[PDB]
Design a protein around this motif. Structure first.
Motif, PDB file in Angstrom:
ATOM      1  N   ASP B 116     -48.414 -24.333  24.350  1.00 16.27           N
ATOM      2  CA  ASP B 116     -48.956 -25.180  23.296  1.00 16.27           C
ATOM      3  C   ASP B 116     -50.073 -26.055  23.835  1.00 16.27           C
ATOM      4  OD1 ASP B 116     -47.026 -24.130  21.629  1.00 16.27           O
ATOM      5  OD2 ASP B 116     -45.937 -26.026  21.401  1.00 16.27           O
ATOM      6  N   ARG B 119     -53.213 -24.219  24.508  1.00 13.52           N
ATOM      7  CA  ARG B 119     -53.944 -23.888  23.291  1.00 13.52           C
ATOM      8  C   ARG B 119     -54.632 -25.108  22.694  1.00 13.52           C
ATOM      9  NH1 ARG B 119     -49.226 -19.870  21.201  1.00 13.52           N
ATOM     10  NH2 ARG B 119     -50.312 -17.875  21.634  1.00 13.52           N
ATOM     11  N   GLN B 120     -53.968 -26.263  22.742  1.00  7.64           N
ATOM     12  CA  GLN B 120     -54.573 -27.488  22.241  1.00  7.64           C
ATOM     13  C   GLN B 120     -55.795 -27.875  23.055  1.00  7.64           C
ATOM     14  OE1 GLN B 120     -51.164 -30.037  20.224  1.00  7.64           O
ATOM     15  NE2 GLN B 120     -50.820 -29.601  22.412  1.00  7.64           N
ATOM     16  N   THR B 123     -58.662 -25.431  22.361  1.00  2.42           N
ATOM     17  CA  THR B 123     -59.114 -25.438  20.974  1.00  2.42           C
ATOM     18  C   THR B 123     -59.750 -26.752  20.573  1.00  2.42           C
ATOM     19  OG1 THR B 123     -57.594 -23.762  20.096  1.00  2.42           O
ATOM     20  CG2 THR B 123     -58.277 -25.501  18.587  1.00  2.42           C
ATOM     21  N   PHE B 124     -59.238 -27.878  21.061  1.00  2.34           N
ATOM     22  CA  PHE B 124     -59.807 -29.166  20.701  1.00  2.34           C
ATOM     23  C   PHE B 124     -60.713 -29.732  21.780  1.00  2.34           C
ATOM     24  CE2 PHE B 124     -55.588 -29.246  18.403  1.00  2.34           C
ATOM     25  CZ  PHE B 124     -56.135 -28.934  17.167  1.00  2.34           C
TER      26      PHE B 124
END
Lengths: 325, 325
Positions: B116, B119-120, B123-124
């Motif tokens: 997680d 991915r955060q 992505t951010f």
């Protein structure tokens, strides 16, 4: 300044100095002000000269502390408005004290310690001596050659004098920046560029003249004018050629006349020109007698040229201690 | 990050993560570290994932503190090397934890909070969203016209497209700076120049694309490329035209093709071009049906043009919420 404050203990002043001392006593900062030894209490308006000289003392204290930090570290937190920034922001209050003393009949007092101090200020200013920068022409030529090669416009070294003059003039009168951050520089090229940046960063009244060693053509002076303007030297210092070898002394008046022929330079020179006349090398390659005599001729015909162009020429004699120089 | 440190309590890792955790434990700063609440003691090498993630906590702590000062005041004393400057200086330690966990048979653990978090991050990034800048073409033309007039070379407004292309190409391929500090600017001119300066001061991964409203010619895109390069924008953002009015959607493929024709620009574009397609204004000046159909055809022929120039075109659809937009 403290001893001067102790002496100026009069109570008579003009309406002018009265008004100014009242102004200072308004923003008097009713504080302890214990960092001083003498006069740590707010100075009463009974002694107005002490009020004004008290403000001069404050700006002197902060001027000294700022320069002390600027030297010790790389920076200072002392506000520039708290110091003396002008050559005569300093002079103004002392001038006022002198006018006051004279108006009130105290010209003898004014012509004492106050006059000594006035003369010291107007003679030494904020930096005891104005500094000259001297550099050989070939270093400026190397810089400009780097600039023209990087700009893909030719090689300033290979250019004739005519071409150098026309180009330098077009850039001096133009408004677009020359080189950029990405100009390829040698340690020498960066040396001269950085000395120009240092000149730009520092106060104008700290410097004197930029003397060009081995100066032979107007392009040598104009190169320095352009490099100064391009290094964002706010108040550019006067350029002065150094003719020291006998060959350069023989051809000096012609070169100065050709420089004054350039209308742009004669209009920016503001009717005043200084040229240096070296004495060391002249009597080394030729005879001492021939050197002295050629020096005399040089001064004479340089004055002739300056008078011919209505320029007040002041000549800078690079004299030695020994007769040989 | 602290909850992630709490879960990663394993004691097996590869030799890679072992070596790295030993490094971090070498410069572990044997200190109290009381500013954190949890894990204030130096983390033992027994739990290597916690060692590494603890360092990630240090860099996140200082990244946040720096960004907070930079925002609140104008500056920060937090050293940049203490923070995460790259989009994936952040990612690397986490990737290392993931490779380690997989090697030791713990891919299931790796596919939990750590995946997680991966991915955060990916992505951010360091700035939740990449920011676009949009400005109308006429404002860039006002700027350039000011520059050519101040350079006494003509009027960029009055110039034809051909002439703007020749000039913009010579300047984009040239190496000399354009305007300087003394360029006369309007509040609008200073607005666009200042947005370019702000863009240059801020991190590259904080910005997205520069969208040109009312874009009609290759000179409109090249104009922004030049303003970016000249305002010292280190990593210039991609330029993207906005075709929204029906006439502009009708003329978009021709204009994009004419742009791709400039080999200088297609070679710097790196095989990728984004062009925006507005939906609001089309069905306002023409019918909704004619607008929809024209939008479809425009998309179709823009793709044809990009394929014809071997450019991967990605299109930016300015769709609204209402069917009319």
């Amino acid at each position: 300044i403290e001893d001067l404050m102790f002496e100026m203990s009069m109570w008579r002043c003009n309406d002018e100095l009265r008004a100014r001392a009242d102004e200072v006593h308004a923003n008097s900062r009713k504080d302890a002000a214990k960092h001083y030894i003498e006069f740590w209490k707010s100075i009463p308006t009974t002694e107005p000269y002490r009020v004004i000289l008290g403000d001069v003392r404050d700006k002197l204290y902060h001027t000294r502390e700022r320069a002390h930090q600027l030297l010790s570290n790389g920076h200072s937190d002392v506000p520039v408005e708290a110091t003396f920034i002008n050559l005569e922001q300093f002079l103004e209050p002392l001038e006022l004290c002198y006018r006051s003393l004279c108006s009130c009949g105290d010209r003898p007092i004014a012509d004492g310690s106050l006059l000594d101090f006035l003369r010291q200020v107007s003679t030494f200013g904020l930096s005891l001596v104005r500094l000259d920068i001297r550099q050989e022409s070939d270093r400026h030529t190397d810089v400009l050659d780097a600039i023209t090669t990087h700009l893909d416009i030719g090689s300033y070294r290979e250019w004739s004098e005519e071409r150098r003059q026309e180009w330098l003039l077009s850039e001096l009168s133009g408004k677009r920046p020359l080189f950029g951050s990405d100009l390829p520089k040698t340690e020498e090229i960066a040396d001269v560029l950085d000395t120009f940046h240092v000149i730009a960063e520092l106060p104008a009244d700290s410097f004197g003249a930029y003397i060009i060693s081995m100066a032979t053509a107007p392009s040598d002076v104009l190169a320095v004018e352009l490099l100064q303007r391009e290094c964002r030297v706010k108040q550019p210092l006067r350029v002065v050629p150094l003719f020291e070898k006998l060959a350069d002394l023989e051809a000096a008046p012609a070169a100065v006349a050709r420089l004054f022929s350039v209308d742009w330079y004669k209009n920016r020179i503001n009717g005043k020109q200084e040229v240096m006349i070296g004495y060391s090398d002249s009597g080394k390659d030729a005879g001492r007698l021939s050197a002295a005599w050629q020096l005399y001729k040089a001064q004479e015909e340089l004055v002739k040229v300056a008078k011919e162009y209505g320029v007040k020429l002041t000549m800078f004699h690079g004299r030695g201690g020994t007769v040989g120089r």
